[PDB]
Amino acid sequence: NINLFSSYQLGELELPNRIVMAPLTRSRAGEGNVPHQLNAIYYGQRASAGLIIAEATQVTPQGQGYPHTPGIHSPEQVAGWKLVTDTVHQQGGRIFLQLWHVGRISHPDLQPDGGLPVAPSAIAPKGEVLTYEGKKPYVTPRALDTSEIPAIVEQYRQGAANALAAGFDGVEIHAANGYLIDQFLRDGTNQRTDEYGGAIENRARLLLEVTEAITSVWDSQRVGVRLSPLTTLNGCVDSHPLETFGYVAQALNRFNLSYLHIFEAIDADIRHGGTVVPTSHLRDRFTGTLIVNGGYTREKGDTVIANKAADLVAFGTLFISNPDLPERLEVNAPLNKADPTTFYGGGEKGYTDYPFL
Ligand SMILES: Cc1cc2nc3c(=O)[nH]c(=O)nc-3n(C[C@H](O)[C@H](O)[C@H](O)COP(=O)(O)O)c2cc1C
Ligand SMILES: [Cl-]
């Protein structure tokens, strides 16, 4: 008799429901990659979520991969995010910041001094990347030196401390979707021969060291980690995802985190001889709160919470188009249809103008 509307204790935070707004890049940052009042309105409109996870936000300038995503590395960015967290709190909500470093998923045109994007290994992604001059081929990223990995961890640590000064309730470490930490996790993108490559413990080392550093800034119950075991996004694949992600789920127990958040790839069942990483494997392996995500509905989300298969259910696409998604789900209202043409960039249209019930 728990469902999507049941309250939940997440550390010291009292969530009114089990509905989470998934992190959604909207590429609507202002000059200097600073959030602004329109962003504050957008998140304030969605404050009925049990928890909002804000869009991926680069922790350092080299961590940007797409034009006009917000950062959390400068004082102006902290002040713009404070507008957002002030508004969400005024509206009675709770919000965590998703901390990002895109690693190889970038272009020199977006990097300081026009440098190469950094990565575990020098493997160019396939296809094209958007720059300020339009789409261009990806370049081959530079493989970080072993001695540079502490600087990466320290960029995440500072990002987390800036998020604390911005007034967030917590942080989510983006270890999913083929970005930097995921690039280290997966053997398709990591062919290093130091203590950060090879065995799973080595490939997970960057994640674990970033997590340790961030739990020295935040109470650990305010730190979450997102994984996406069966995505193929951004050319980042593991050859043994059950072993890799099962190991990671158990290795994170040390830290007493807020949660583990799993994005279940939408094509996992069909773009496999079935799902090779059942979330139940990770649920067994991680001893804390589990957030699931990917194509959820009222019916699917109620099932997973009733069954104890997950504690929280995050919705991405439906929160783009339904600012009051919890109320709509609760009363079985119609749901507004999301318009992909306004997902990224632009202004209020397709962002703050989806109507309330
Ligand atoms: C426009 C858009 C932007 C996204 N940006 C992010 C992001 O910033 N961080 C992230 O971890 N996932 C991101 N995702 C993935 C979503 O959080 C979510 O996992 C995915 O859309 C599947 O959930 P859904 O079926 O409820 O939409 C994005 C998805 C969309 C559609
Ligand atoms: Cl602390």
UniProtKB/TrEMBL annotation:
Q: Which residues bind Ca(2+)?
A: E12, E14
**Which residues does FMN bind?**
P23, T25, A56, Q98, R226, N293, G295, G316, T317
- Whether Cell membrane counts among this entry's keywords is no
- Say which domain of life the source belongs to: Bacteria
Sections of the chain in a coiled coil: none
Q: Does the keyword Metal-binding apply?
A: yes
Name the UniProt key words of this record, in alphabetical order: Calcium, Flavoprotein, FMN, Metal-binding, Nucleotide-binding
Protein's name according to its UniProt entry: All1865 protein
Which organism was this protein described from? Nostoc sp. (strain PCC 7120 / SAG 25.82 / UTEX 2576)
